[PDB]
Amino acid sequence: FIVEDLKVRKGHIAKLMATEYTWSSLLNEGLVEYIDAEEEESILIAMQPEDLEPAKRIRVSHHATTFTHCEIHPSMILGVAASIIPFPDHNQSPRNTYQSAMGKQAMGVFLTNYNVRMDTMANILYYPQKPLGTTRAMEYLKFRELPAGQNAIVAIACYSGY
Amino acid sequence: FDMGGYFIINGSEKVLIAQERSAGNIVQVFKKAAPSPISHVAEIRSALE
Amino acid sequence: TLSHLRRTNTPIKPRQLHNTHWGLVCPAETPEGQACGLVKNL
């Protein structure tokens, strides 16, 4: 986003949610901007939108105002495989760097046309399930439509020693 | 749900892995080793787009 | 599949997760081995 004295409004929120039944609008409407890494050097971005202008989780110095842009949502720093991690902020970072590579190791329907293609080797889960824990990034990875595992009743506990 | 972006070559689906490279036609200033005669170097990777 | 199409090979620290990697590369998605931080994901 770009900000003055927030460029984008709840009006533009409807200029889109209706059209679902445009983005290049927001680009040419001057409400958004493609900032490469060097152009970042000469800008200042606001983390959360409403949270960065004028019990729970502790915050920092949002009061220092001079901002030029805003972060769409903080989540978007992730690659696909790491996006499906639920609550990566409550996880030792290496755990995240693993599940990222293990989500690629898992099973489940990978394409809906598996019955009709002759690919050397391929696993498919018997009854895939959309996870109970979902990130809002999931709707775009088409992950609820092509899950990778199952929601198992998991009892964290000692029992037999196996 | 297949989104493409890949080629099909004699059957197998081949993907092109993003090859990273330190850009050209840019000027960069570098120190050098302690025993190196050169104190500093200015580099440009001259290449036509 | 998706992860493979948004993959970044970097030839032979150039591995360390950089600040300029914010927003453009995944801070976690990278393989443990002779590629950790070298071959990144978008």
Binding site: G11, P49, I72, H73, M76, L141 | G4, Y6 | R6
Partner: peptide
């Protein structure tokens, strides 16, 4: 009402928009 700024939930409609145009293989294709 075209007035108010935006909320944390409103941003998601923006992200939803980004893909419906570019998608996930955006750069690979372009």
């Amino acid at each position: 009402d075209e007035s108010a700024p935006i909320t944390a939930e409103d941003s998601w409609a923006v992200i939803s928009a980004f893909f419906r145009e570019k998608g996930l293989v955006s750069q690979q294709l372009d």
